[PDB]
Structure formats: C-alpha cells, structure tokens
Amino acid sequence: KCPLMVKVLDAVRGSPAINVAVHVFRKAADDTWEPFASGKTSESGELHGLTTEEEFVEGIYKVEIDTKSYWKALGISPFHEHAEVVFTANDSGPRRYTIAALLSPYSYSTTAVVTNP
Amino acid sequence: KCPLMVKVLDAVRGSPAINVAVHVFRKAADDTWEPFASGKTSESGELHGLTTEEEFVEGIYKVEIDTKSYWKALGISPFHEHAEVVFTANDSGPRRYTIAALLSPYSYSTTAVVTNP
Amino acid sequence: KCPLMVKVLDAVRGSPAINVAVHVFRKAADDTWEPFASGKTSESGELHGLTTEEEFVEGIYKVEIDTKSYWKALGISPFHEHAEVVFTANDSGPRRYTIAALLSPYSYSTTAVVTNP
Amino acid sequence: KCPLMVKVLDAVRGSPAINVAVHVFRKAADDTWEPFASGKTSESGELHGLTTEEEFVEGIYKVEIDTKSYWKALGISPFHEHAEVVFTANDSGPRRYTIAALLSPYSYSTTAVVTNP
Numbered sequence: 001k002c003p004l005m006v007k008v009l010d011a012v013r014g015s016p017a018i019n020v021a022v023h024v025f026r027k028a029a030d031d032t033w034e035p036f037a038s039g040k041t042s043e044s045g046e047l048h049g050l051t052t053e054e055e056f057v058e059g060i061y062k063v064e065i066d067t068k069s070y071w072k073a074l075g076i077s078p079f080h081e082h083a084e085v086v087f088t089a090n091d092s093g094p095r096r097y098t099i100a101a102l103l104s105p106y107s108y109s110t111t112a113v114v115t116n117p
Numbered sequence: 118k119c120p121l122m123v124k125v126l127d128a129v130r131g132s133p134a135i136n137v138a139v140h141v142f143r144k145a146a147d148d149t150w151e152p153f154a155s156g157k158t159s160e161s162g163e164l165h166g167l168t169t170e171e172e173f174v175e176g177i178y179k180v181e182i183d184t185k186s187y188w189k190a191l192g193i194s195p196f197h198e199h200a201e202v203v204f205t206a207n208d209s210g211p212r213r214y215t216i217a218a219l220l221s222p223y224s225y226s227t228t229a230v231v232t233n234p
Numbered sequence: 235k236c237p238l239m240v241k242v243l244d245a246v247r248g249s250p251a252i253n254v255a256v257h258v259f260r261k262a263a264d265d266t267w268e269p270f271a272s273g274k275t276s277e278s279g280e281l282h283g284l285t286t287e288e289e290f291v292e293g294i295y296k297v298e299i300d301t302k303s304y305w306k307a308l309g310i311s312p313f314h315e316h317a318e319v320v321f322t323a324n325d326s327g328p329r330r331y332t333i334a335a336l337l338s339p340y341s342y343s344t345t346a347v348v349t350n351p
Numbered sequence: 352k353c354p355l356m357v358k359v360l361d362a363v364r365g366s367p368a369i370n371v372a373v374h375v376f377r378k379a380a381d382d383t384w385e386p387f388a389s390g391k392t393s394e395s396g397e398l399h400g401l402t403t404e405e406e407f408v409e410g411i412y413k414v415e416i417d418t419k420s421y422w423k424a425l426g427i428s429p430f431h432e433h434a435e436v437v438f439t440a441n442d443s444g445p446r447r448y449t450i451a452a453l454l455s456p457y458s459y460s461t462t463a464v465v466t467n468p
C-alpha cells in the first residue's frame with residue numbers, strides 16, 4: 001500500500017512469483033509474535049495494502065513469505081519453510097518499506113528499500 | 118562441522134563475517150522454538166560442531182544469525198534484526214547441511230548446500 | 235522503455251542506486267561487441283528508454299552496469315569494475331526484459347524478469 | 352588455490368556446481384581480453400590452481416563462468432550466456448582472491464572474498 005509493500009520474484013522462471021502467501025507479525029510487549037497483517041502477491045508479484053500509516057506503528061516486525069507453499073504448488077520440493085524478514089520499523093519516524101525477495105528452491109535473497117516520504 | 122555447518126560472508130568488506138553469533142532452534146510439538154545449539158563464527162566465518170548425527174534428527178529447524186550486532190560492532194547501520202533460515206531436516210537426502218549467508222546492511226541471501234561425504 | 239529496462243538497488247543504503255551509468259552492447263557478425271544503447275538510472279534507480287521494439291532485434295546482448303564509477307562517486311573503493319549481464323534476446327520472438335541488479339561493494343546480484351507482451 | 356580461487360554453487364539443487372568451465376582473462380594494453388587461465392570446477396564446485404603469485408600481477412581481470420552450458424547439461428533452461436566477474440587485482444590488499452558465484456537459471460550473484468593466510 002503506502003507504508004509496507006512486498007515484492008517477490010522467481011529466479012528459476014525469471015518471473016514474478018504469483019500467489020505467494022505473506023504473513024506479517026509484530027512483537028508484542030510480552031515478546032510474542034502478534035499477527036499484524038497478511039495477504040498474497042498478485043500477478044505482478046507484488047503485495048500492496050497490507051497496512052495503513054495509522055496501524056503501522058513503531059515496532060519489531062516479522063515478514064514471513066511462505067516460499068515452501070509456493071514451490072510445492074509448482075511441484076517442487078524446496079529447502080526452506082519460508083523466508084523470514086525481521087526488522088525494526090519506524091523508530092526514526094514513518095518510512096515506506098519495500099521488502100523484496102528473490103526465490104530459488106535452495107536459496108533466497110531479500111532486500112529492503114526504505115524511503116522517507 | 119558434520120551434519121550442520123554455518124558459513125557467513127560480509128559483502129561490504131569482502132571478508133568472512135567473524136565473531137557472528139548464531140543460534141539454532143528446533144520446533145517443539147507446541148510450535149514453540151526450543152534452543153538447540155549455538156556458537157560464534159570463526160576467523161574464517163565458519164561455525165562447526167553445532168550438533169552430532171545422533172542429535173540432529175528430522176524436524177523443523179531455525180537458524181538465526183545475529184547480523185544486527187555484527188554490523189553495529191563495525192559501525193555500520195543495519196536493517197535486519199537477524200537473518201533467519203528455517204528448514205526441515207530430511208533423512209532421505211544427503212547427510213551434510215551447510216547454511217551459507219551473504220550479508221549486506223540492507224540485504225542478505227542464504228543458500229543451503231546439501232551434500233554427501 | 236518497453237523492450238529493455240534496467241533497475242539497480244543499493245544494498246548498503248537500502249535505496250535505489252541513482253545515476254548509475256549503463257552501457258548495452260550487441261555481438262556483431264564478426265563476434266565483436268557493437269555499442270547498442272546507453273543511459274543512466276533515474277531517482278528511482280530505473281533506466282527506461284534504452285531501445286525500441288524495432289531496434290531490439292535477436293542477438294546476444296551485454297549490459298554493462300558501471301558499478302565501480304557508482305561506488306567511487308560515493309567515496310567507496312569497490313571490488314568489481316562493473317557488473318556484466320550477457321544473454322541471448324528475442325530468439326523465440328519479442329519479449330520484455332527487465333535486468334535487475336543489487337549492489338554491494340564486494341558483491342552483486344542480478345536477476346532477469348522476462349515477460350511475453 | 353593460492354592467489355585466485357573460484358567457487359560455484361547451484362541454488363536450484365542445493366549443491367556445488369560441478370564440471371563448470373571457468374575462463375580467466377587479463378586486459379591487454381589495447382583493451383582486448385587475453386586468455387590467462389582456465390579450468391573446470393571440481394566435485395566440490397571449486398577451481399584451484401588457476402595461477403601463481405608470480406603470474407598474478409596487478410591489472411584488470413575477467414572471470415567468465417560458463418553457466419549456460421552447465422544448465423543445459425542438467426536439462427534446465429537458462430537466461431545468461433555466462434556469469435562475468437570483472438575486477439582489478441591490487442597488491443595493497445589481502446593476498447587471496449576467492450570469487451564465489453551462486454547460480455540460478457535466471458539469476459546469479461557473485462562475491463569477492465579477499466583474505467590473508
């Protein structure tokens with residue numbers, strides 16, 4: 001949406017990774033992971049609309065990209081259960097975050113692009 | 118060294134990532150993460166001797182590489198709290214699991230190299 | 235533009251890589267590299283308008299991303315002279331190609347996203 | 352093994368990339384690429400003994416990893432012709448150069464690990 005976007009690419013096919021489930025959690029006061037938002041990537045491999053400026057407060061967030069479910073639906077047995085992307089957000093004020101992930105059956109890469117709006 | 122090894126490289130300095138704390142967890146029947154093994158990477162960026170064949174049974178494992186503290190010790194501002202690598206140990210495949218992680222302040226990749234002696 | 239786009243990210247700063255020079259070559263009949271197109275990445279780290287559907291014929295192309303010039307302008311001494319991305323294009327008909335590159339001082343990654351228009 | 356080593360991993364199969372042809376060139380005074388050294392990766396994905404301290408003088412070097420043929424031998428359709436790694440050898444820094452390449456059909460990364468004995 002505005003504050004948090006996720007974009008996933010498939011390194012085997014050289015294509016957007018479509019229909020990839022994404023779960024976002026936020027660390028609570030008791031140090032447990034509270035469900036914060038979720039969704040799926042579109043045809044373009046992008047997931048917009050996860051949250052709002054209002055809801056996306058300071059905190060430690062975990063973005064779980066369900067890579068195994070993605071590869072299995074393509075008849076592939078991958079190594080990882082999911083990608084995890086854990087980071088502190090907005091601790092110097094609001095930012096826009098794009099979490100990019102590149103997927104291969106035994107590997108993935110991830111990159112944060114952080115903009116000041 | 119044997120069943121499980123972790124190797125970490127620093128993409129900013131073109132070096133092994135030395136003295137990086139690494140924690141391994143095993144998923145418990147109640148879906149909590151139980152501490153399993155840990156250590157710090159060597160001068161060569163490697164962490165050997167985390168577990169044994171006997172101890173390393175099939176199951177879901179999480180490897181956390183404490184990248185934020187690594188970068189902070191170098192006076193470099195990082196994005197991630199840590200790199201996570203989550204996977205299922207399988208007895209069908211090759212016997213050796215090497216988790217390799219390539220670190221940048223706002224990006225990391227990880228690959229699993231699964232081999233036989 | 236339409237047929238060939240280049241997008242570059244900075245893994246140290248978690249930002250688009252701005253003002254990155256890009257040179258594209260095409261292998262000639264005599265197996266030498268003919269200059270084909272060039273440009274620079276914009277504020278968004280993207281380079282559009284390199285070529286047209288008419289000019290972008292079948293062939294072997296080389297996309298040179300001038301990473302050393304990029305890092306030097308930021309006071310950094312990197313390892314690589316430039317990224318090279320060499321590939322056969324349009325050998326099964328016209329496609330759209332996006333060449334993505336992620337830059338660190340001692341490392342880079344690249345990924346092709348290929349669409350059928 | 353000594354001054355220059357090349358190591359290659361397969362991100363699709365989670366293995367060393369075996370029997371991969373690797374060519375090293377040195378830039379000549381007329382900006383042509385002169386063949387310098389070559390070989391094929393071992394069972395461990397490594398290529399040692401390319402050059403000697405005596406032979407490996409300062410200059411610009413290009414390492415070409417013949418990835419297209421690697422993937423074709425596995426019946427996997429690749430994007431790149433080859434992976435290129437271009438850099439300047441420097442006597443000021445550490446004495447050992449390890450070029451590591453992580454391969455996917457439509458993506459590759461490469462990092463330089465520059466160390467001392």
Ligand SMILES: O=C(O)CON=C1c2ccccc2-c2ccccc21
Binds near residue numbers: 008241
């Ligand atoms: O994830 C990584 O760090 C590797 O690069 N991934 C990129 C990615 C993923 C999804 C959408 C766009 C990208 C992208 C764009 C430019 C450079 C690198 C990347």
Ligand SMILES: O=C(O)CON=C1c2ccccc2-c2ccccc21
Binds near residue numbers: 226
């Ligand atoms: O981390 C990744 O998956 C990217 O590649 N990483 C490699 C790595 C990390 C630590 C130690 C050795 C490596 C390595 C060796 C050859 C090819 C790729 C890689």
